Amino acid sequence: TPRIQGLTVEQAEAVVRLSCLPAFKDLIAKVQADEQFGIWLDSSSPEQTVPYLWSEETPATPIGQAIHRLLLIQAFRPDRLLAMAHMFVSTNLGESFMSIMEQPLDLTHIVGTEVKPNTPVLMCSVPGYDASGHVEDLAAEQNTQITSIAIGSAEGFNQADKAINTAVKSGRWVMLKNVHLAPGWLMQLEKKLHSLQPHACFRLFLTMEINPKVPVNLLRAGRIFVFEPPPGVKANMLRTFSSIPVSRICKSPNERARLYFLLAWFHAIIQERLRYAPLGWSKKYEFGESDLRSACDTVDTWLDDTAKGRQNISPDKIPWSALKTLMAQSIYGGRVDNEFDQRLLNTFLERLFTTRSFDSEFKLACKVDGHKDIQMPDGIRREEFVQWVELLPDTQTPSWLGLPNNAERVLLTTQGVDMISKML
Q1: Closest Cα to residue 34, out of 3, 58, 55?
Q2: Segment AAA 6: which positions?
Q3: Residue 8's beta-bridge partner residues?
Q4: Of the chain's two ends, which shows fewer C-beta atoms within 10 Å, N or C?
């Protein structure tokens, strides 16, 4: 592994890792002859501007050029490997091959026609996301009665059996909540379903969170439907503001809405900071909806005790140290194991939760991309806050979190080496 100027040791190792094939015998010579090679290495999207580095004697096919680009990128810039696998499959299978999935999933016709009656609609949902909105939208759009139930008891078992016996003849779209908590009942449902003769309009939605306790034969005979919470600080804040009711945030005093906005921003920034582990947190915790609910109850009761029904209080009147200590030691620092992670949560709360965050000068996230800054909306109402989070920029660098801007890059290169291993 030599030290090529402009190439890292890993890049030279990957050059050796591909250099057993006659397309790139003199790839070191080609790279050292390419003057704009460093500029291309610094490019934001190098896939569309791959320089001519493959050497051959014949006019190569577009698939050959695409795989030459893939070879060179795994040599040099492995971060863009997933996006150029996207355009590589676009090269040899059409650009509209995956254009349905870089697009919100059209569930309606697919579940109405492409799903067998005897194959239940496996309603997979990652924890933290609830997909009952989709089945409610479907039920509203066909305008028929739907029995959405929660399976958590023997009475729930009996009602589920009665509803299944009704729906197997009525042809109904029936959703069964949190079925992953009863693996034995799920096994019973599957082994009955394999012998069932369902209606041509009857399908079962099995809303589950990711657990390895599910029946493998149900996964055999199931129409899997995996969703995710859409990535984005904006998406997390909109989800938080959709879950939080309007009355609770509009209730007096008028700084309660600002405190809830601070809570939503903090929860969104930590939850988005989970997905860039290990640099965000040293391990993946579960900052969930119950954690947000505990935080909301804490701030609600402490602000109620402080204000005692006052329609306005001073920015210095708010128990900032009380909320800081409750967050860091009981709400979100309880699951924190390492003291380094505890200190990190403390520094988040020191920056965010303070009395200095009620003026126009303060910034929610300093040095976004080194030059831009984000400032709080000065409105005092939930409508103004939700308008500010609607009108946020679509771009979201890791400096929004506080991670350096190359956090997305290191996540991409870890995803690329995982792509290599998973396809191996």
Answers
A1: 55
A2: 85-301
A3: none
A4: C
